Design a protein around this ligand. Structure first.
Ligand SMILES: [Mn+2]
Ligand SMILES: [Mn+2]
Ligand SMILES: [Mn+2]
Ligand SMILES: [Mn+2]
Lengths: 478, 478, 478, 480
């Protein structure tokens, strides 16, 4: 009795960009809606350190950021992990495959996958004309090589002029059939065709979208340009500061012209609805292989996107737009006997690894994350009450504690604080830190932060108190 | 210590078609906005003789129109200049390259560029079936040859029926990847790949757009057709005359149906937003070559476009639509220590040459233009108070003086005058010449014009006074 | 001194579908507008027998319908004419060429053209699987052969399902560059390239459009679908009868759903604006060959299209929609010394032949049509006051007299009459025949009809009076 | 004013006797080169003193002797710190300068006086390492390889048929003939003529990578030689060669091939040369289309020869005629040089091209080691050299030699062995004369010349006025 596993990873998808989680239901995600509502949808799933590299180290190893050391974004840091999610499945006799984005270093280090067909998207560390030929450009991306075999050697990832950290958006400029999202599913179907029939499979399907460039196929772009509402709400509350400058094309903060905000949403949502159709394609193929009833699917995003919310862009922030991720288990064969329903407790990306090994392999994994199995059966025994996350981001480096009621944030280089009522202010528009009615929570929350940060090399804590630090103390890896 | 230089030239782009300079902010130029606002934006930059050939002679040589003799448009006039912008950089050890439009004569005369990959757009003097094979059609344009290699030998520049001096507009009829704007950036990236690594580079990227034909890719055309405002303001004031005829398809004056005015703007703005994305592509490539921090970029247009304003089309007029050009230095490596800000003083296209040689090479150039270096540091010492420009245009030949307060225009074949308050009437809608309250300015302004024109071969001045001349006296080259 | 001549023929274009002639100015024909307004525009030009074959026999020979015998539509009738328009030019030393639609029989009979590159559109008599191979389908049309060489042998003229006599419409389903309208201009440019340089040319450029199928390129179709006015006026007056049935897809009469009427107009107008751009392409090429100033251009349509007006479709009717045609001389080299202006007198398609031979060759042609030369110089000496036209159309066979004030119509199989005031009722909405105030005109008009029809084989006249005839008496050729 | 254009045509690894005009048996088909060489000035005794690619191309471009440049053997990625080069002097004098094809310089895209270089160096190991810089490797190092990927698809590469660039193996080109690198050089030379600056004269280097291996000419030319090469192929084995009797390495420096392999190698090599010959004719026809056939001077040269199995030796880097003697001629159909056209028998070095062209065309001196051949063209031998000192590092077979108009004297300093050949009566070097005492006087003089050239060299060839054996670790390819 060994079920197959498909781990579907998308990059930079917000939790509220799953229509089921959304409040306004504008985004079209009919396939993911069905999957999440029919399985176990994690309504409170979080990427504690919300950017590509630290989130993916956490996904693969189950490790908290202090254990792995990945407290912010840094490329080309060694991945010295043996006990990884695909490695444990391999040890138990699975064929292990990854199609798409790994974002590990060295880029083709397999970390337990038998075989990897790699496309990390646009990575500056793989697109330098003076670095090693075999590790750069079309030799670093099997999708880009496919693009050159398909469109000719002159084709490249940047042909339409959109930057991978930019809010600029416009439709995919080539035939739709060559889009990277289709390619992941096409190659996932090729894996099903060509896999070893004598063993079960663990397959990671890892889409680089909806991470920019924001270039969905024209159909999906025009869909949203035609129907997005007239006014687009940025959830501007009582704490945001506008610097009143023309936005950098790769801005981390600021405000767009309304037309630019509209195009950004149409690109971003368009990429998501496109992923949704292509995942449905993969589901249809699973059925052609008679694997629709013996396979368990977990969908997750590595982190969110601020998308202009609070005058912020990109990620690496403590706010919900960055840290809250969509996440659900889809179990159409009913291999998990727990009653299917939405899960409210605080789940971390670190929990996926031990949950999958427990639920599918019936084994314990010694790591920081914890198996959600008991949550599925309605038992919050031993479950965390809070999450400590953080991210290095220069002046805007953050440290935060999230509970089911509060989010307490500290910016240690600025030495400023925020407090939000997550139940009544889910979009974090009302900073409460300066209201004396919350003096008790704030003192308790500061006390818990000392608990997490005492002893950290950056010097956050001196003599049991939180102290402003200089920007030179911030590191992305411990 | 030798920074690289990229000189980006566009053709027929209005100063107010850079969104940053625009008042209504309708045009989408997010990349150029960022570049101009982050560097030094010249808010008062002018092409004194506003058409292709005299402006480009001024750009390349720094010479005033009396010195070069190019007082209007004329093709196939010798370019007997040795002291040119690329030549000085070559002398100081730079590799010099031009991709795109030169508009010199002979067409492939290099004037200091080591290598030129040429595309002048549609030029009547290069598209005559009875002129030399090697200098005509696809042998005159390396872009057109690319088009024939890409689409087949039957492809040509006029396939969709749009004329290069016409207000008619419609989307590019072929796949977007073959557009001439993409080709300039593709070939600029090929130059970066293949350049001599032992020396710095001076690269001119010279787009033929947004000069007509007005055929942007469909995406950009539809963008504006969908969102341009309902009513399009032509700034019709108290002096324009409407001749009440069906407009010639290559008209120099008149009025369009509202739908034709809308399509013209959608074509023109669409070409500009397309250039903007493609420049962003080139910026991304500069970073892949690790040249994003050791390169100085100057963006400029050779002249503007009347675009229907004042019932005028094309260029060669004294009005702001023709003479005011977008122009800025982008310095992301902070190689220039002056505080970055907008520059208000009167800058001419003649100033680019000596400014670049001063700022980058630390040398003096003996020419008519002057280095803007001191302006960047806040010092208007020795700066001009006024510009004398002109253009031959038959009956509408003009002579004008522009200061920071006034524009005084004389049409010497018509022997009529205009006066505009540039501060309070920036769109030149209120001719003041017949108001007696301005008798003193007008007399002074006429006196200055005698100063500029006394001795000119056309006979503008007889016995110290300005006199009407016959049309046969007008010349385009002295 | 021999000017070149280009005769541009379009098929089924209404006179009021030239924007200059139109009242509402909705249709976009900027190139034709300029040509017609700058030359001599014939505001009252008529195809007396308004369908393809009889109009083209009249165009080529100058003969009235009684002389040629072509009083209605009939295919495969011999063309036993020696004295034709191209033949006279050939005799005077011209190279003669036709590109496009001839509609003669045998199809490749040249009738004075040195060379013909043929595309008659969809012709039922050339699309029969049991008729001669060499004269059918792709062997009858050099455009269709081009389509098979371009798209593959499976391509055909009917691939999108639109019928050549149908009001159904939709965009061209293939790449725009393969449209038949582009092909005429491409092949007209090939003729200019390859012509005999030692002699002048007479070139007929004969477009099959805007005759259905109504499949313009997508750009032009969407243009009108987006901007045509909400309500489309059919000019329904006091005489039309609605048969209240679902319209045949090739209906000669009836009423369409509003959406179908909108799509028909968007297809029809779209084809016309497309022709307009492609004619501008040909004008640009004429200039590349230095023939823009030594060439005289005459534009004409063979007949109109009812387009749903008066609950009528197609042509072959006596009403203005069918009989009034656009027609103008374009003379940018000013080879004709007459002052350029619009021409109001009644001109027939029979007049083109003798006008061109008189104006360009300085010779008399013995035919029924008359040279318009004196009209251009303001002299209506000897000019007709009236036109007698007609068409065989079963029950709706017609006979009519048109003057500058009246149109009098007789339907001899129905034996009904109509009378319209052409000055005050230009759209023929008020039948006056039953108003006693017009008894004198009507009696005179009936008397003139006896004059035209006495002796005709059909038996219209018996003992000096007009008499109802049976449908079996109607013929299309005498 | 009225300055002539110049085309320097360089081929790689072509033997002097693989020009039919120079050959004894006239088997190889080079009709176009025969015409140009016999109608112009053919250098019958032109030499590459250090016969491998990099030292010969340094000598060609700079005019420097191997001791001045330090290039005494093959070595990649040595800096080219030369300002005074052949294209630079023409550029300085107002010429547009262009190279299409093989430069073999370092860094690969250093222009060294060319306004523009369209680069194809052939197969170079230092340009084909997956761990070296992307923009300098494989299809980013070779504009021909990029053209092949654009033409055949990204799958295509330079080694698809399995032939090694240092190998005697041969077979026809496996792709359509129109994509061959020899055609590409001429196609792009025509593109340059189309797009050049019309206001200045041009200096154009057309640098073919062939007939250097892979030995893969188009099928037509391969079959031509397989169908008609003689049954017996002479290796010119004399009284001094020694066979090692091992299976030959596919990139062997010495040995003996099976008959069929030797025949295939000749068919590939000759086939490549006859193919170049047709493609150069193509270029001549294009020159006339641009009306430049009578205002252009052409100099054809090879950088060094190829042993081709002769004396049981392969490749190059040897002191024998197969390696050091190169075809070389000036073609001047416009009669821009007034000297009567004839063949030139005196000793000419590859170092002489640079000063000769600058003298003949520009009327200037260059301060280099080579000398202008102009006086020879006019029949004046006054002061012209009577000997050449050459050498090459090649491990145990490292050589030092003196070539005069009559003798070649060779010293192998690691083996401490000597050879002497009569170049008039024994032009194929089959009879070593060193051990015959009749020649002791000549040998004495030749050793004394070598002492003069080699005194003070860092390798320690000379001690107390005498040539002495050196250890192999003393051998270097570039002097310090
Ligand atoms: Mn990510
Ligand atoms: Mn211009
Ligand atoms: Mn017709
Ligand atoms: Mn070589």
């Amino acid at each position: 009795n060994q079920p197959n596993v498909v781990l579907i990873v998308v990059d930079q998808m917000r939790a509220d960009a799953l229509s089921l989680n959304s409040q306004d239901k504008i985004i079209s995600t009919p396939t993911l809606d069905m999957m999440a509502s029919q399985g176990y949808n994690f309504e409170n799933c979080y990427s504690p350190v919300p950017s590509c590299v630290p989130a993916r180290a956490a996904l693969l190893t189950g490790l908290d950021q202090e254990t792995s050391g990945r407290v912010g974004y840094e490329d080309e840091v060694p991945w010295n992990f043996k006990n990884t999610l695909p490695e444990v499945f391999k040890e138990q006799g699975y064929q292990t495959e990854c199609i798409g984005k790994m974002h590990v270093y060295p880029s083709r280090k397999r970390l337990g996958f038998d075989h990897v067909l790699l496309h990390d998207g646009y990575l500056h560390v793989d697109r330098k004309y003076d670095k090693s030929y075999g590790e750069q450009f079309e030799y670093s991306s099997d999708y880009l090589m496919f693009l050159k075999e398909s469109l000719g050697s002159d084709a490249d990832l940047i042909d339409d002029g959109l930057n991978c950290n930019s809010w600029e958006a416009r439709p995919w400029m080539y035939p739709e059939k060559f889009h990277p999202t289709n390619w992941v599913v096409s190659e996932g179907i090729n894996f099903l065709r060509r896999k070893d029939p004598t063993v079960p499979f663990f397959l990671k399907l890892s889409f680089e979208k909806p991470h920019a460039p924001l270039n969905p196929p024209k159909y999906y772009f025009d869909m949203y340009m035609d129907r997005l509402p007239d006014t687009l709400d940025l959830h501007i509350g009582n704490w945001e500061k506008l610097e009143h400058v023309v936005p950098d094309v790769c801005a981390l903060r600021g405000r767009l012209k309304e037309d630019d905000q509209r195009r950004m949403l149409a690109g971003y949502y368009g990429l998501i609805s496109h992923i949704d159709h292509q995942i449905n394609r993969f589901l249809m193929a699973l059925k052609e292989f008679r694997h629709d009833k013996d396979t368990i699917i977990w969908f997750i995003s590595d982190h969110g996107d601020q998308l202009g919310e609070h005058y912020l862009f990109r990620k690496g922030y403590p706010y919900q737009g960055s840290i809250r991720i969509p996440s659900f288990i889809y179990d159409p064969g009913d291999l998990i006997s727990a009653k299917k329903h939405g899960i409210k407790e605080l789940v971390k990306i670190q929990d996926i690894f031990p949950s999958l090994v427990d639920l599918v392999l019936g084994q314990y994994v010694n790591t920081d994350g914890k198996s959600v199995k008991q949550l599925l059966f309605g038992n919050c025994e031993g479950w965390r009450r809070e999450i400590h996350g953080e991210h290095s981001l220069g002046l805007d480096s953050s440290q935060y504690i999230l509970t089911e009621k509060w989010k307490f944030i500290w910016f240690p280089v600025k030495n400023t604080y925020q407090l939000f009522d997550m139940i009544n202010d889910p979009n974090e528009m009302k900073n409460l830190y300066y209201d004396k009615k919350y003096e008790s929570i704030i003192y308790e929350m500061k006390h818990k932060l000392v608990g997490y940060l005492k002893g950290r090399e950056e010097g956050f804590v001196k003599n049991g108190q939180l102290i402003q630090i200089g920007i030179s103390n911030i590191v992305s890896t411990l």
